[PDB]
């Protein structure tokens, strides 16, 4: 009685475009074109697909199948699979928090640009502003200029001294105080996700119609726009020129694997939640297949969208697009790409749809990000919770604002990197490995093939079987070992992070991980019996 059976989605296309909305984000736009053109160019497509087929797709489809089959949250599903690994559901809840502290501040920057892009003369065109230094040298100014080590462009000056105000902080040590503009921007973001999540899957699923389709439109406008620019073939040459020798490096495969994993994002509980609210009779194999193939191809065309404008920018400057595309991160889109689109007719248009496109890219993904955690807590503490959804949703949203207050600082950008590199990647890889191993090895991949066989009507192929049993946990294990062995020294804006950052990072990387061995200790520590007896009753799910 009472609630009993769970709710169901409003249409097939909503959940298709919804999982597509989670899959597609900023990184699809600029991360993949950079990592592609840097690691052997077009040849990077060869391992990228392999790491997709053997790694990303199986985790994606396994996660999705479990989600639609068991209809449980990220915490409650472990109660009915492997209770000792229930802490996994908790770990994600912490991980997501760390992500929601920086991912939306980027959307706040794109939002600050968007509202600052309504003026007839764009701010980052002239140097006669209140934030530019004496180094600021700009165009529509005398030709022959010969750039100096200390000179700075109006776009770099605008991004550095205004929207970030990063010159007012010395690094991780001193980063305060808070830029209230980005606080209001990210507040508006938390509002626009508040009215798109608070109701549940119906609103996220309806806002997704806009947040997942518009990026293709803006990418299409900047695509046909960037294609008509003179000398844009340079960026395409640098973008797709095959350099097969780079394929001999054992690093490149690692980069491809990490890319496809962190662009499909399986085992994060978001796909579990998005899959939970669907029909048991409804097919999901085709769903997972098509959805991934969209995320990959969308990245492929996004490469052109970036490197066409970068090619035109390298033509107006002096070629070897790599030099104009050295820095990967927020500067490739907020400085180089913005300064590139500044010299184009009706620049207000392309600017508005560009930064609006950035916000539109982050919105759907963060919808899904929150959706997974919300589903997990509501399903884990029912009746004690579900009293209202706006209460718990409001709680997690304002929590994400207070979490971003460290990021809204002057040196917030610094923290963004520290959180983007150190915290998420190793832990997420770990929980994906433990999750995959627990579904494929503990629960038994045989019974999983029986669950899919009861789901779609047919048992999954021997390919999916061997991928889940061996190829996928080895796929995650590869990136785990390669990551731990060579953690990266990182620098941002002529500032090398202190030697101790990794320590801090490891804290932020493990402070979220402590819950699973301590929960195994809590489970095995709480029920008396013998060690062999209690772990045998704790590995087998509920019989009824």
């Amino acid at each position: 009685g009472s609630q009993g059976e769970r709710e169901t989605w409003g249409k097939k296309v909503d959940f298709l475009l919804s999982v597509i909305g989670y899959a597609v984000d900023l990184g699809n736009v600029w991360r993949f074109p950079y990592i592609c053109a840097q690691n052997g160019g077009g040849a990077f497509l060869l391992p990228y697909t392999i790491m997709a087929i053997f790694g990303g797709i199986p985790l994606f489809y396994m996660e999705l199948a479990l989600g639609q089959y068991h209809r449980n949250g990220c915490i409650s599903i472990w109660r009915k699979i492997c209770p000792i690994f229930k802490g996994i559901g908790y770990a994600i809840c912490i991980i997501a928090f760390y992500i929601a502290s920086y991912y939306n501040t980027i959307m706040a920057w794109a939002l600050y640009y968007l509202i600052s892009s309504f003026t007839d003369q764009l701010p980052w065109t002239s140097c006669k502003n209140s934030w530019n230094t004496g180094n600021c040298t700009n165009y529509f100014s005398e030709d022959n200029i010969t750039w100096t080590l200390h000179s700075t462009s109006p776009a770099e000056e605008f991004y550095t001294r205004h929207v970030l105000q990063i010159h007012r902080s010395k690094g991780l040590q001193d980063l305060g105080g808070i830029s209230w503009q980005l606080a209001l921007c990210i507040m508006l973001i938390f509002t626009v996700i508040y009215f798109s999540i608070w109701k549940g899957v119906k609103t996220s699923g309806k806002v997704v119609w806009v947040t997942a389709t518009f990026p293709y439109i803006a990418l299409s406008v900047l695509l046909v726009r960037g294609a008509t620019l003179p000398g844009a073939w340079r960026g395409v040459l640098f973008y797709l020129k095959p350099n097969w020798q780079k394929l001999l490096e054992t690093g490149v495969w690692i980069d491809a694997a990490a890319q496809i994993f962190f662009s499909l994002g399986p085992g994060f509980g978001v796909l579990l939640a998005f899959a939970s609210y669907n029909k048991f009779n409804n097919n999901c194999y085709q769903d997972a297949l098509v959805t991934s193939v969209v995320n990959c191809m969308t990245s492929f065309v996004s490469g052109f969208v970036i490197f066409t404008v970068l090619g035109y920018m390298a033509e107006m400057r002096n070629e070897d697009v790599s030099e104009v595309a050295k820095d990967a991160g927020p500067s490739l889109l907020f400085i180089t790409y913005a300064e590139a689109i500044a010299n184009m007719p009706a620049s207000t248009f392309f600017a508005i749809i560009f930064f609006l496109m950035l916000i539109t890219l982050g919105l759907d993904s963060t919808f899904a990000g929150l959706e997974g955690v919300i589903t997990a807590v509501l399903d884990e503490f029912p009746h004690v919770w579900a009293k209202r959804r706006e209460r718990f949703v409001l709680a997690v949203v304002i929590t994400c604002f207070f979490g971003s207050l460290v990021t809204l600082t002057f040196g917030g950008a610094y923290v963004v990197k520290l959180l983007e590199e150190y915290a998420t990647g190793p832990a997420v890889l770990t929980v994906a490995l433990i999750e995959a191993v627990a579904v494929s090895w503990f629960y038994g991949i045989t019974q999983f093939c029986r669950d899919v066989k009861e789901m779609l009507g047919f048992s999954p192929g021997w390919f999916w079987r061997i991928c889940w049993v061996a190829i996928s946990p080895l796929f995650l294990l590869f990136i785990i070992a390669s990551f731990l062995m060579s953690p990266p020294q990182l620098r941002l804006f002529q500032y090398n992070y202190p030697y101790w950052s990794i320590i801090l990072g490891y804290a932020i990387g493990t402070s979220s991980f402590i819950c699973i061995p301590t929960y195994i200790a809590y489970r095995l520590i709480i029920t008396p019996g013998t060690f062999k007896e209690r772990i045998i009753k704790s590995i087998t799910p509920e019989t009824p």
């Epitope: 750039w147 100096t148 080590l149 200390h150 400057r317 030099e323």
Partner: antibody
């Protein structure tokens, strides 16, 4: 005006090391890249690498990686290039030349440094 | 990398004649070629940058042209002191490479 006074000629036995200086003057030293070009007897110019005087930002050539080591000192506005594993091919004239960051031309050069690697 | 090829190692000219040295690059360069003048016993002296622009302190008798891959250095009034070895160098892709060097010998 702008002057790049290099060091004198050096006669060094093969297998040893040799360091060449480059006293820069007449401009804001921190405002320009400091480059090193190799010129073999009867050969063309050969770009060794550059260095950012502010932080010692060395950007070498794959052909000279591990062959030359560029350093810089702001306290005296002087850039140095050290060479190890000296052979008969290194017996060439070396120049230190100033360059902006873009466009990357070599506006001012040094007088050259005659290096002879022989026992 | 980039291979700057000066097919003609030597070129003969006279005082007052119109002389022009060619320069072939590996790939498309747009307008990123600089011409240097190394007089026998002196350091290379910068004459042209970015294909056509002249550098400061260079007489009007030195000009540059070309747009794409092949570029040309022109002297209208050759003087007795214009006797030198001319090099061409690209300035767009890392690393920066030079030409083989064209010695300009004067005929009298």
């Amino acid at each position: 005006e702008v002057q790049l006074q290099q060091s004198g000629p050096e006669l060094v036995k093969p297998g040893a090391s040799v360091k060449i200086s480059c006293k820069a003057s007449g401009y804001t030293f921190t405002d320009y890249y400091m480059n090193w070009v190799k010129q073999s007897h009867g050969k063309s110019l050969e770009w060794i690498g550059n260095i950012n005087p502010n932080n010692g930002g060395t950007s070498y050539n794959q052909k000279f990686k591990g062959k030359a080591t560029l350093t810089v000192d702001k306290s005296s506005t002087t850039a140095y290039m050290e060479l190890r594993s000296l052979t008969s091919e290194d017996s060439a004239v070396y120049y230190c030349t100033r360059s902006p960051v873009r466009p990357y031309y070599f506006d001012y050069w040094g007088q050259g440094t005659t290096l002879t690697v022989s026992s | 990398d980039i291979v700057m090829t000066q097919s003609h190692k030597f070129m003969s000219t006279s005082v007052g004649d119109r002389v022009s040295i060619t320069c072939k690059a590996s790939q498309d360069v747009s307008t990123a070629v600089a011409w240097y003048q190394q007089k026998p016993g002196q350091s290379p002296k910068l004459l042209i940058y970015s294909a056509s622009y002249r550098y400061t302190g260079v007489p009007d008798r030195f000009t540059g042209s070309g747009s794409g891959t092949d570029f040309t250095f022109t002297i209208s009034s050759v003087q007795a002191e214009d006797l030198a070895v001319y090099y061409c160098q690209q300035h767009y892709s890392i690393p920066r490479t030079f030409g083989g060097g064209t010695k300009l010998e004067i005929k009298r």
